[PDB]
Design a protein around this ligand. Structure first.
Ligand SMILES: Nc1ncnc2c1nc(SCC(=O)NCCc1ccccc1)n2[C@@H]1O[C@H](CO)[C@@H](O)[C@H]1O
Ligand SMILES: Nc1ncnc2c1nc(SCC(=O)NCCc1ccccc1)n2[C@@H]1O[C@H](CO)[C@@H](O)[C@H]1O
Ligand SMILES: Nc1ncnc2c1nc(SCC(=O)NCCc1ccccc1)n2[C@@H]1O[C@H](CO)[C@@H](O)[C@H]1O
Ligand SMILES: Nc1ncnc2c1nc(SCC(=O)NCCc1ccccc1)n2[C@@H]1O[C@H](CO)[C@@H](O)[C@H]1O
Lengths: 261, 250, 263, 263
């Protein structure tokens, strides 16, 4: 079937890429980056994130595969030494499909509205000065946050930025999103919950401005300034990312190999 | 068929009599606790063996609770609604705790394991696979509704009770070279089993909600999301996040 | 004696400043914004920081005073209504001086030459763009390889500021120290970090050395500027201290209490 | 001169103890268990703590030495392979002294006084733990949780670290208060951040309802009936260590929490 391979850009990934593509020269596999049915990323989780957003329009017809030329990643969990075995197993078709939840981020202005999908997380920070927003949960005011910013994470994203912010780790089979605080000043004037908050499906977390209406909104690796922001809504997306499962690599093992060892 | 449990004070017992006027203590379909969350926990453990046939209602004679959701003065209209049978049931996940014949426990809030005198050292096994060797005060495994309790004080995350899961938090982990721990709270879905296996000392203080019993000769402690759920009789709409807001945000 | 007054800029602070200047004119006082012996800040902590750095070359000959026109600040102790008595007590010279420690920040490059900075609150180091990875070297000895958003080194009086939000401990400003806090460390097996905040005494030097990227966004009391081709960033408790004119007794722990607990 | 050796109690520590005693017999070393000038601890930090409390009445004339028979300890930083060198180094008399601060714990109900090398904690003797935290004779907060931990500087790497407290170099004469599983709701508002107090600062813990508190000192956990006040302050007493080679505190922190590549 149709496939394509993205590379980190360094000699390790570029050479491994060409070596794998040559491997598909012995099987009924056509190279196509317009409408691929299988996308292989080579490099790191960051590289994998670029590959996700490169085809966030064809998520339902694409099985992603991650290969790390450096250290182990939670998305790039295949070693380059197993690149040969992957090609053969992929060319045959003996693989299952695993799906992870995604984060929907909607931004309203005072035009229209913009929506974004995140595989890891979405963060909102200030355009320079102090970051002050109201946190509205299901059309109900919850807290007035003051600090550096807020981070809404996917379940698979919990092991990334979320973890460094003291967030909890969630098994990606759990369809949910997690909100963590970034350097919250927690005084009497600005009282926040402190604890990370985990939200289920169909729950909407709305971030509404108080004074300044310009915000730095990041989606995974990408980050851009949004001016005249009226509202920033978070909810678990109805869209999912599909992985190609060849072997059995448990989420918790992957957590163990990263942080415990 | 219904029944009413009281805290023990004069106000709760009086309200119990004042509500009983508007009864099966063996085969109940409606259990009404009068007191607080702690009192509610007692009513839960009194009927663990028929949770699929019982809806619970909490009345807080003191401060607002996460289980006791009704005000004392609102007991007048509560009877007329619980008699018509016009109510929908809300289900919360529970935590199963097996100790190893073997003893199994059900918790509405959380279950914790600490050493009965001395250092607490345990191997954390996740799905038959070693994850970390823990050394410290202990570990806490919390239900979603229990996250607002001890879990929160231990730095755990708050999660909505509609999410079927359990959350593991640390209790003063030393987290060094010998005993490297994850630090982060861990949230496990259904059918995931966390196993605690001793290294030397096999005597542990195991607590289930309000009950803290001492266990000797422990070989394994298994944690997983129970197949049973607790049902609440719902009349009005009280959002979980509102209860969280009212409790901590003020 | 010689003095000057800085203002937040709003109508309130500007008005109070003019009235204090006229008040001072009734005594043996002279306005001098070049070589003052007393510097008065009217506004908030942020206003106080600007005044601090405006005269950081004369910290040895200046006694600072802070007046908060809004909410109570850790540096701005005095209320606007007390400005009257404050003028009189200043003119008589009826006050003692209290000193807080400062943080020295040295930036070395590859050879332009060298740059040093004094901090009243804290000094942070983050990346210019991309992963922030540095080697933390304590007194010439390697301690950890840090990956994350950045690192924050706080003065004692700075511990109630950014340091606190980052989980740092609150430290009484009579203690001559500096506290290093992590900013979202990844803390995995490759980049294992201590996690805990570190409190260093005087003469202890913390060296942040680049692993790959030599460009860093360095901030000193929210004065964040881009430093390129950085070879080393050294942290140590300065020998210079900021001096406060003391009249009444406003305990540090009460300032903390009134600001975070209840007032 | 006069020396003594305490052992962990196991086969390895008992043997090493006898081995050193035999070695000292070759030099001018007198073994005395009631009036030693140098106390050697063989085992772990726990064994070191017992040795401290065993001779806490004569801290003025005793220099302590720790040997860890297991993993590296913060007090027991000598390894068994270096035992031969220690005996010779002790007999030679060539060593300087290093002093660490201690925590004074006063319990008022007649007045009970305790000294802590690591820390002192106050938990509940059953039921909710609710106390009023008073700093220098003024209310600071009302705490509710599992308990509170007051740590020495050298104690910060112990229980204090696990509770999220900051690591502090023992050259700093201070004490650090950390919260143990606090409840932060609409009723009980605490500072959250660990607090570092200098000398001459008193932290008083006063009961709200329950007067029975489980007080621990380094690990002598004792139930105290009818408590009116628990006072915390930096002691004037200090523990003295015998120094021969350079083994930095931060190195000990590094080798214990980060990594130890040569072991
Ligand atoms: N999250 C913080 N919580 C407490 N205090 C902070 C924080 N952040 C900062 S400055 C770093 C920064 O850019 N933070 C993001 C925007 C922000 C957010 C809140 C307050 C000021 C600025 N300071 C203090 O602000 C002083 C600047 O006037 C600095 O010295 C920091 O101590
Ligand atoms: N401290 C973090 N610990 C774990 N993971 C993080 C972190 N920070 C980030 S992105 C936030 C950021 O720009 N931080 C400035 C320094 C930095 C550090 C790492 C990667 C990129 C940039 N991600 C993950 O990086 C992914 C982009 O490749 C994002 O999706 C975050 O999950
Ligand atoms: N979690 C702790 N992490 C580091 N260190 C601790 C801790 N806990 C303690 S004592 C508190 C206690 O009894 N905890 C029960 C479980 C436990 C677990 C490990 C070690 C001792 C005890 N200390 C240190 O134990 C020393 C006694 O040998 C005390 O001085 C504490 O510093
Ligand atoms: N630090 C904690 N913050 C929040 N909640 C806690 C904590 N600790 C506990 S149990 C351990 C302990 O020492 N608790 C004293 C507080 C308490 C609270 C309610 C009822 C009895 C006692 N729980 C909850 O107490 C419930 C018993 O009613 C248990 O289910 C814990 O979740």
């Amino acid at each position: 079937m149709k496939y394509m391979i993205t590379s980190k850009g360094d000699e390790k990934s570029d050479l491994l890429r060409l070596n794998m593509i040559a491997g598909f020269g012995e099987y009924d596999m056509e190279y196509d980056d317009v409408e691929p049915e299988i996308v292989i990323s080579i490099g790191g989780d960051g590289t994998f994130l670029s590959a996700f957003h490169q085809y966030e329009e064809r998520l339902d017809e694409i099985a992603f595969i991650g290969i790390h030329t450096g250290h182990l990643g939670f998305y790039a969990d295949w070693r380059p030494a197993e690149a040969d075995k992957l090609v053969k197993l992929l060319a045959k078709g003996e693989y299952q499909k695993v799906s992870y939840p995604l984060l929907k981020t909607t931004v309203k202005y005072g035009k229209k509205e913009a929506t974004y999908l995140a595989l890891n997380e979405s963060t909102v920070k200030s355009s320079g000065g102090p970051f002050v927003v109201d946190v509205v949960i299901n059309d109900i005011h919850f807290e007035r946050f003051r600090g550096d910013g807020l981070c809404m994470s996917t379940p698979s994203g919990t092991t990334a930025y979320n973890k460094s912010l003291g967030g909890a780790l969630m098994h990606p089979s759990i369809e949910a999103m997690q909100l963590t605080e970034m350097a919250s000043i927690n005084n009497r004037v600005y009282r926040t919950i402190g604890s990370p908050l985990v939200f289920p499906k169909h729950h909407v977390v709305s971030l509404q401005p108080v004074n300044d209406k310009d915000f730095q909104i990041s989606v995974d690796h990408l980050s851009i300034l949004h001016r005249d922001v009226q509202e920033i809504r978070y909810e678990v997306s109805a869209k999912k990312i599909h992985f190609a499962r060849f072997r059995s690599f448990p989420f918790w093992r992957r957590v163990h190999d990263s942080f415990i060892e």
